[PDB]
Amino acid sequence: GSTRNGRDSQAKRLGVKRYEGQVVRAGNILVRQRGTRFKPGKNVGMGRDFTLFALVDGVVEFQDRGRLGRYVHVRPL
Amino acid sequence: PLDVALKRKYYEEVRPELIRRFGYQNVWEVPRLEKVVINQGLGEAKEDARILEKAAQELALITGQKPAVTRAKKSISNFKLRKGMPIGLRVTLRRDRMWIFLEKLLNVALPRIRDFRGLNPNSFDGRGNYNLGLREQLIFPEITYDMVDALRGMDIAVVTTAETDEEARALLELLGFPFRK
Amino acid sequence: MLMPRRMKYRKQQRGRLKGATKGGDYVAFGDYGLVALEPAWITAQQIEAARVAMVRHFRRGGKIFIRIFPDKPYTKKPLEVRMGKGKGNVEGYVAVVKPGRVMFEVAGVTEEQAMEALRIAGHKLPIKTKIVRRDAYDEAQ
Amino acid sequence: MKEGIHPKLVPARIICGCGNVIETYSTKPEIYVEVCSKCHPFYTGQQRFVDTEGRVERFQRRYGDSYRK
Amino acid sequence: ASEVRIKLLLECTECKRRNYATEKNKRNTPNKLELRKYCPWCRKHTVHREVKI
Amino acid sequence: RLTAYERRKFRVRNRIKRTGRLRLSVFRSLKHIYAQIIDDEKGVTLVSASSLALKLKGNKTEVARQVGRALAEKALALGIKQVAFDRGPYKYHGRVKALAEGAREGGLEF
RNA sequence: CUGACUGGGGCCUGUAGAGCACUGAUAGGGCUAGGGGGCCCACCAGCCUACCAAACCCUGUCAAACUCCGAAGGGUCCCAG
RNA sequence: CGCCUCCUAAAAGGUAACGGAGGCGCCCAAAGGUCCCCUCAGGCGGGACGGAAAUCCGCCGGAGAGCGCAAGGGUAGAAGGGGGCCUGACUGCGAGGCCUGCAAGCCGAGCAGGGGCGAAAGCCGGGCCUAGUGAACCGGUGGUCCCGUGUGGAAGGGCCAU
RNA sequence: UCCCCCGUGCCCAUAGCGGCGUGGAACCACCCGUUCCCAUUCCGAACACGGAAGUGAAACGCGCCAGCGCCGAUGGUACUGGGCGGGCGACCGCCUGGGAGAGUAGGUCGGUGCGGGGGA
RNA sequence: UUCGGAUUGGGGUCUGCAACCCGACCCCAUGAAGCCGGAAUCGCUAGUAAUCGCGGAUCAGCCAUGCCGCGGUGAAUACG
RNA sequence: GGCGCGUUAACAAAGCGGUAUGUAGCGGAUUGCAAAUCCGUCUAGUCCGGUUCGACUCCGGAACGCGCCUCCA
Ligand SMILES: [K+]
Ligand SMILES: [K+]
Ligand SMILES: [K+]
Ligand SMILES: [K+]
Ligand SMILES: [K+]
Ligand SMILES: [Mg+2]
Ligand SMILES: [Mg+2]
Ligand SMILES: [Mg+2]
Ligand SMILES: [Mg+2]
Ligand SMILES: [Mg+2]
Ligand SMILES: [Mg+2]
Ligand SMILES: [Mg+2]
Ligand SMILES: [Mg+2]
Ligand SMILES: [Mg+2]
Ligand SMILES: [Mg+2]
Ligand SMILES: [Mg+2]
Ligand SMILES: [Mg+2]
Ligand SMILES: [Mg+2]
Ligand SMILES: [Mg+2]
Ligand SMILES: [Mg+2]
Ligand SMILES: [Mg+2]
Ligand SMILES: [Mg+2]
Ligand SMILES: [Mg+2]
Ligand SMILES: [Mg+2]
Ligand SMILES: [Mg+2]
Ligand SMILES: [Mg+2]
Ligand SMILES: [Mg+2]
Ligand SMILES: [Mg+2]
Ligand SMILES: [Mg+2]
Ligand SMILES: [Mg+2]
Ligand SMILES: [Mg+2]
Ligand SMILES: [Mg+2]
Ligand SMILES: [Mg+2]
Ligand SMILES: [Mg+2]
Ligand SMILES: [Mg+2]
Ligand SMILES: [Mg+2]
Ligand SMILES: [Mg+2]
Ligand SMILES: [Mg+2]
Ligand SMILES: [Mg+2]
Ligand SMILES: [Mg+2]
Ligand SMILES: [Mg+2]
Ligand SMILES: [Mg+2]
Ligand SMILES: [Mg+2]
Ligand SMILES: [Mg+2]
Ligand SMILES: [Mg+2]
Ligand SMILES: [Mg+2]
Ligand SMILES: [Mg+2]
Ligand SMILES: [Mg+2]
Ligand SMILES: [Mg+2]
Ligand SMILES: [Mg+2]
Ligand SMILES: [Mg+2]
Ligand SMILES: [Mg+2]
Ligand SMILES: [Mg+2]
Ligand SMILES: [Mg+2]
Ligand SMILES: [Mg+2]
Ligand SMILES: [Mg+2]
Ligand SMILES: [Mg+2]
Ligand SMILES: [Mg+2]
Ligand SMILES: [Mg+2]
Ligand SMILES: [Mg+2]
Ligand SMILES: [Mg+2]
Ligand SMILES: [Mg+2]
Ligand SMILES: [Mg+2]
Ligand SMILES: [Mg+2]
Ligand SMILES: [Mg+2]
Ligand SMILES: [Mg+2]
Ligand SMILES: [Mg+2]
Ligand SMILES: [Mg+2]
Ligand SMILES: [Mg+2]
Ligand SMILES: [Mg+2]
Ligand SMILES: [Mg+2]
Ligand SMILES: [Mg+2]
Ligand SMILES: [Mg+2]
Ligand SMILES: [Mg+2]
Ligand SMILES: [Mg+2]
Ligand SMILES: [Mg+2]
Ligand SMILES: [Mg+2]
Ligand SMILES: [Mg+2]
Ligand SMILES: [Mg+2]
Ligand SMILES: [Mg+2]
Ligand SMILES: [Mg+2]
Ligand SMILES: [Mg+2]
Ligand SMILES: [Mg+2]
Ligand SMILES: [Mg+2]
Ligand SMILES: [Mg+2]
Ligand SMILES: [Mg+2]
Ligand SMILES: [Mg+2]
Ligand SMILES: [Mg+2]
Ligand SMILES: [Mg+2]
Ligand SMILES: [Mg+2]
Ligand SMILES: [Mg+2]
Ligand SMILES: [Mg+2]
Ligand SMILES: [Mg+2]
Ligand SMILES: [Mg+2]
Ligand SMILES: [Mg+2]
Ligand SMILES: [Mg+2]
Ligand SMILES: [Mg+2]
Ligand SMILES: [Mg+2]
Ligand SMILES: [Mg+2]
Ligand SMILES: [Mg+2]
Ligand SMILES: [Mg+2]
Ligand SMILES: [Mg+2]
Ligand SMILES: [Mg+2]
Ligand SMILES: [Zn+2]
Ligand SMILES: [Zn+2]
């Protein structure tokens, strides 16, 4: 009822922040996620909250490897 | 390796008879003896006594190997037992020590059981293994009445390379296991 | 009267009555079926009113298949209360029925018995219905 | 084989009441028993003990028959 | 934090300066915490000991 | 299903390939020992050595040390110095350890 | 000249619908751990059920907080008007 | 009445109601770092006391277990179980970003000092992740030796830590 | 350039489960031992070392099989971006562009790169 | 427990037309409770109490540890 | 309708995440007999669903019972 319910939490604005083909600088945040929905590929690091960030300047590339998961790469120029 | 008579007898009288009866074309098809696992489910040494030491010493004398402690995987009220507490012992015998223990069991341990009428022929695992249960520990030759403080039993697991009960049964009777009709 | 024995959630949102029926569109158990022609919430009371009418009309013989179940909770606010203060209390259960859904079937009766029993059962329901008999199309499914 | 925790096995003999001597390895170099596999009744075929009459519980007594037939 | 889980300071045993603040459960860990930490004053790793906050 | 052997192999090698170096992969059978230098980016083998090709016979730990020297001597002529040692399912010990020291003594940076 | 809008190209998504692989719900029948009585019998067990019901098999369904699936669209970047 | 999780929410993000359901105001000295090893729940069969269920053996079983606490996401090619050595639960910073009215909140490569584990490649600036929290003012304690009301001190302030 | 074996990749079940057959010259494995390096909360089972009496039984590799599993059209439909209408309402039609899921036919007992050893 | 002798298994004797319901006794095996008894309650003043054995009636046999008798050994205490 | 509380055996009535009482009832003692008195003994957590190794006990629901509020018009 109006006494039992009525609570919620703030929205977290998760999701992919840079899509394939976009040009990124080193440090750019690529994915915000809970757990490894996407996995860190080449020249990609993962933070303590599973945030994926670019390690070098370059071009974002997404890859699906079936049972091995979905990977995000950065290909240098 | 110590020249045990039981291992000698298996290679001299048992193996040639087994291939005669079952017609194995490979010398590795004939059932072998893998290991013997002796388990003592004490259960009385959970928290009322550290009497695991008394049983560990007795088990080491019978088999020549110091046994290992097994702990409870979870807590159960009906047994008044908590997770992680020691409630048993286990020793694994392989190779020469395996042969030595079975020779004593078949010759000087089983004959000392009260009202022995043979082993259970329906205790075969169904895939080529055997298990038997003992109630007394003083039947073993190294145990005397003087150092016996409490009565304890054990389970003995006999593991073979045989695939079926009928082939595992044949190895055991020739080895010397006496069975009820 | 039918209702679920257990429920994950006590209350449901009022959905939508769009589209033709999803499943249960062909006669599968009996010989004669009653088919819905327009959408509605069919209450548990209406289902039991229709079933008992067929039982009485089928003196001795007959087997009845009810192919719908009222799993959706139905909520109502108490009389003389204003809007707000949370969702109303559960008062009954309904089955969501869409056009083409076979609601009842009968077996073990003659043709004359089946048509009269299904006709009376339809008068207990808030929607237009039609009586159908099992055919090759039902067996083809 | 860990060291310091296992009793070292030595060659040993087990002597039975029937004079049988079994040669093995044990932690005690001389053992005496009261029954072995070569004299236990269940092993030596039947070795009928104090009970050997099959309980003779049937009519196998004939209980006289001096009475009239 | 709580009455049982308390806040504490870590003090360098060579220059006596408090360099780190942390916590512990004083029932689980009744004895004083001793840990090796970098002392920026000593510019090297030294043994630090628990002191009251 | 996977065995402890297969899980061990994956766990060790996934860590190695993360660094992006050239991996020195060692295979140790009951008879011989084999070494490859692999570039995972292209998936090609740069240099390979073994006791089977060199016909080395003797104490296995002694044999493995000479295989490491030959692989190291082969590697430097091709301009390779920096590698990562991939032990796979083997413990860093015994024959596998002897090959690593032999490679290091021959002038390989790892 | 970078704009709204539009064209091509890549990537992101879990709604509509649908489905039952998961979690719950659920109709009929078959087979049966365990239930109610039962021919009973406590010396000892099977059996009877047009009374329930676990798993399992067949047939048949439901879901905002179910998903083995999954659009139309939408978002974003690059180039072009 | 603040905070976290799911739905409503119309397949980017965001989105209301006295709409539908649940949690938090902690904790861990290891439940942290690293190296090494290991892999579940369940079912079936066998085994002294011993059973629905203790410990033991064999077979099937790919994640239905576990991961301190809600829910969701994630996860055995470990984030789960065990052991050895340790304190990086660092100091000084910080390119670049996410988020965003402000203020807050969040991720972070790399460089220097001095370390831990490892043969090494390497990893380590707490914790599988998202709740466990409170601006400024006023004052307390430790350090620093910056100011010190004619001058040298002192009183009292500042700065750094809490 | 052909074939066999060994090691390491990629695509991520059309690659799998299950059934049957086959391989020891070479390789690989099982195997023989535990003095030595190393090791078992007990066990040379595992990890490790020293070898060559035996065997391809197990494991592994290679072949055949569509029982299960997985892949899966065409056609049609559901739904729908945009444009128009109907119905008291619940809801429903038409035009234009897009277009599933399930089911059916059917397919599949992998494909491919690099290195090394051997034979033709 | 070499205390205690209940219960039960087995082998027998005798009486009686007949020992199953339902006799007594012998032998072998079994070897229960019971460690001096709660509130309470009974007998007894001397050859008495206590303790030990023996006979008789009924009666084929006997469930008699009952009853009626007989003798052996032999106390304590009574202030009031 | 809102808010708060309670359900224990023969009755009245307590504490407790793991273990009552008083008066009765029943067997014995005493008494000519009953009562009184004395010696012993004794019957449980409203129901369903959860959490937990473990629930009369902690949480959710349902039923019944009790207490207070229900006003400005
Ligand atoms: K109607
Ligand atoms: K332009
Ligand atoms: K389902
Ligand atoms: K686009
Ligand atoms: K550093
Ligand atoms: Mg709620
Ligand atoms: Mg709340
Ligand atoms: Mg909301
Ligand atoms: Mg928000
Ligand atoms: Mg939210
Ligand atoms: Mg996204
Ligand atoms: Mg973390
Ligand atoms: Mg076997
Ligand atoms: Mg509505
Ligand atoms: Mg609706
Ligand atoms: Mg359907
Ligand atoms: Mg309603
Ligand atoms: Mg409302
Ligand atoms: Mg309502
Ligand atoms: Mg319908
Ligand atoms: Mg700090
Ligand atoms: Mg390595
Ligand atoms: Mg839908
Ligand atoms: Mg679907
Ligand atoms: Mg339902
Ligand atoms: Mg059914
Ligand atoms: Mg459905
Ligand atoms: Mg729906
Ligand atoms: Mg649906
Ligand atoms: Mg969901
Ligand atoms: Mg859905
Ligand atoms: Mg332009
Ligand atoms: Mg507020
Ligand atoms: Mg707050
Ligand atoms: Mg949207
Ligand atoms: Mg998106
Ligand atoms: Mg959204
Ligand atoms: Mg608004
Ligand atoms: Mg508004
Ligand atoms: Mg409110
Ligand atoms: Mg709301
Ligand atoms: Mg919740
Ligand atoms: Mg709460
Ligand atoms: Mg909080
Ligand atoms: Mg702590
Ligand atoms: Mg943790
Ligand atoms: Mg951890
Ligand atoms: Mg799980
Ligand atoms: Mg909780
Ligand atoms: Mg989870
Ligand atoms: Mg998992
Ligand atoms: Mg695995
Ligand atoms: Mg550790
Ligand atoms: Mg430090
Ligand atoms: Mg800001
Ligand atoms: Mg950093
Ligand atoms: Mg370092
Ligand atoms: Mg960390
Ligand atoms: Mg979350
Ligand atoms: Mg959270
Ligand atoms: Mg906190
Ligand atoms: Mg102020
Ligand atoms: Mg101030
Ligand atoms: Mg201040
Ligand atoms: Mg100060
Ligand atoms: Mg002045
Ligand atoms: Mg001055
Ligand atoms: Mg001065
Ligand atoms: Mg001052
Ligand atoms: Mg100061
Ligand atoms: Mg200050
Ligand atoms: Mg400060
Ligand atoms: Mg190979
Ligand atoms: Mg596929
Ligand atoms: Mg030695
Ligand atoms: Mg084979
Ligand atoms: Mg077709
Ligand atoms: Mg199609
Ligand atoms: Mg199509
Ligand atoms: Mg449309
Ligand atoms: Mg259209
Ligand atoms: Mg739409
Ligand atoms: Mg449209
Ligand atoms: Mg179209
Ligand atoms: Mg389709
Ligand atoms: Mg399709
Ligand atoms: Mg296939
Ligand atoms: Mg006695
Ligand atoms: Mg009689
Ligand atoms: Mg007694
Ligand atoms: Mg005594
Ligand atoms: Mg009396
Ligand atoms: Mg007198
Ligand atoms: Mg008497
Ligand atoms: Mg009462
Ligand atoms: Mg009580
Ligand atoms: Mg009482
Ligand atoms: Mg009483
Ligand atoms: Mg009384
Ligand atoms: Mg009286
Ligand atoms: Mg009376
Ligand atoms: Mg009385
Ligand atoms: Mg007013
Ligand atoms: Zn003998
Ligand atoms: Zn210092």
Curated annotation (Swiss-Prot), chain C:
**What's one Pfam family the UniProt record gives for this protein?**
Ribosomal_L16
The organism's superkingdom is given as Bacteria
UniProt keywords (A-Z) are:
Ribonucleoprotein, Ribosomal protein, RNA-binding, rRNA-binding, tRNA-binding
Q: Where along the sequence do coiled-coil regions lie?
A: none
Q: Which SUPFAM superfamilies match?
A: Ribosomal protein L16p/L10e
Q: Name one GO cellular component term.
A: cytosolic large ribosomal subunit
The biological process GO terms on file are: translation
Q: Per the record's keyword annotation, is Transcription included, yes or no?
A: no
Q: State one molecular function term (GO).
A: rRNA binding
**Record family assignment:** Belongs to the universal ribosomal protein uL16 family.
For this protein, the record's HAMAP family field holds: Ribosomal_uL16
What PANTHER family does the record point to? 50S/60S RIBOSOMAL PROTEIN L16, LARGE RIBOSOMAL SUBUNIT PROTEIN UL16M
> How is the quaternary structure described?
Part of the 50S ribosomal subunit.
What NCBIfam families would the database entry show? rplP_bact
Q: Could you tell me what this protein does?
A: This protein binds directly to 23S rRNA. Interacts with the A site tRNA.
User: What's this protein's name?
Assistant: Large ribosomal subunit protein uL16
Gene from which the chain derives: rplP
UniProtKB/Swiss-Prot annotation, chain D:
Keyword Zinc recorded: yes
Might you name a Gene Ontology BP term for this protein?
translation
Return the cofactor note field. Answer: Binds 1 zinc ion per subunit.
| Keywords for the protein's UniProt record, in alphabetical order | Metal-binding, Ribonucleoprotein, Ribosomal protein, RNA-binding, rRNA-binding, Zinc
Q: For binding Zn(2+), which residues are annotated in this chain's numbering?
A: 16, 18, 36, 39
Signal peptide stretch: none
GO cellular-component term (any): ribonucleoprotein complex
* Cofactor section: Zn(2+)
Give the record's family classification: Belongs to the bacterial ribosomal protein bL31 family. Type A subfamily.
What this chain does, per the entry, is described as:
Binds the 23S rRNA.
| HAMAP family in the record | Ribosomal_bL31_1
Listed under subunit, the entry gives: Part of the 50S ribosomal subunit.
Identify this protein by name. Large ribosomal subunit protein bL31
Record the organism: Thermus thermophilus (strain ATCC 27634 / DSM 579 / HB8)
Swiss-Prot record, chain E:
Gene Ontology cellular-component terms for this entry are:
cytoplasm; ribonucleoprotein complex; ribosome
The record's listing under Pfam families reads:
Ribosomal_L33
- Domain of life from the UniProt record: Bacteria
Task: Kindly give the Gene3D superfamilies that the UniProt entry links to this protein.
Answer: Ribosomal protein L33
Q: Name one GO molecular function term.
A: structural constituent of ribosome
Q: Which PROSITE patterns match?
A: RIBOSOMAL_L33
Q: Which GO terms describe its biological process?
A: translation
Keywords, in A-Z order: Ribonucleoprotein, Ribosomal protein, RNA-binding, rRNA-binding, tRNA-binding
SS bonds (residue pairs): none
Q: Which NCBIfam families match?
A: PRK00504.1, PRK00595.1, rpmG_bact
PANTHER family attached here? 50S RIBOSOMAL PROTEIN L33, CHLOROPLASTIC (PTHR43168), LARGE RIBOSOMAL SUBUNIT PROTEIN BL33C (PTHR43168:SF2)
Family under the similarity heading: Belongs to the bacterial ribosomal protein bL33 family.
SUBUNIT field: Part of the 50S ribosomal subunit.
- HAMAP family documented for this protein: Ribosomal_bL33
Q: What does this protein do?
A: Found on the solvent side of the large subunit. Contacts the E site tRNA.
Identification of the protein by name: Large ribosomal subunit protein bL33
Q: What is the lineage of its organism?
A: Bacteria, Thermotogati, Deinococcota, Deinococci, Thermales
UniProtKB/Swiss-Prot annotation, chain F:
Alphabetized UniProt keyword annotations: Ribonucleoprotein, Ribosomal protein, RNA-binding, rRNA-binding
Q: Name one GO cellular component term.
A: cytosolic large ribosomal subunit
An example Gene Ontology molecular-function term: 5S rRNA binding
**Gene3D superfamilies attached to this UniProt entry:** 3.30.420.100
The answer, when asked if Hydrolase is one of the entry's keywords, is: no
Residues annotated as signal peptide: none
InterPro entries assigned: Ribosomal_uL18_bac-type, Ribosomal_uL18_bac/euk
Top-rank lineage group of the source organism: Bacteria
Gene Ontology biological-process entries: translation
Q: Which PANTHER family match?
A: 39S RIBOSOMAL PROTEIN L18, MITOCHONDRIAL (PTHR12899), LARGE RIBOSOMAL SUBUNIT PROTEIN UL18M (PTHR12899:SF3)
State the family named in the UniProt similarity comment for this chain. Belongs to the universal ribosomal protein uL18 family.
The protein's name in its UniProt record: Large ribosomal subunit protein uL18
Species name: Thermus thermophilus (strain ATCC 27634 / DSM 579 / HB8)
Q: Identify the taxonomic lineage of the organism of origin.
A: Bacteria, Thermotogati, Deinococcota, Deinococci, Thermales
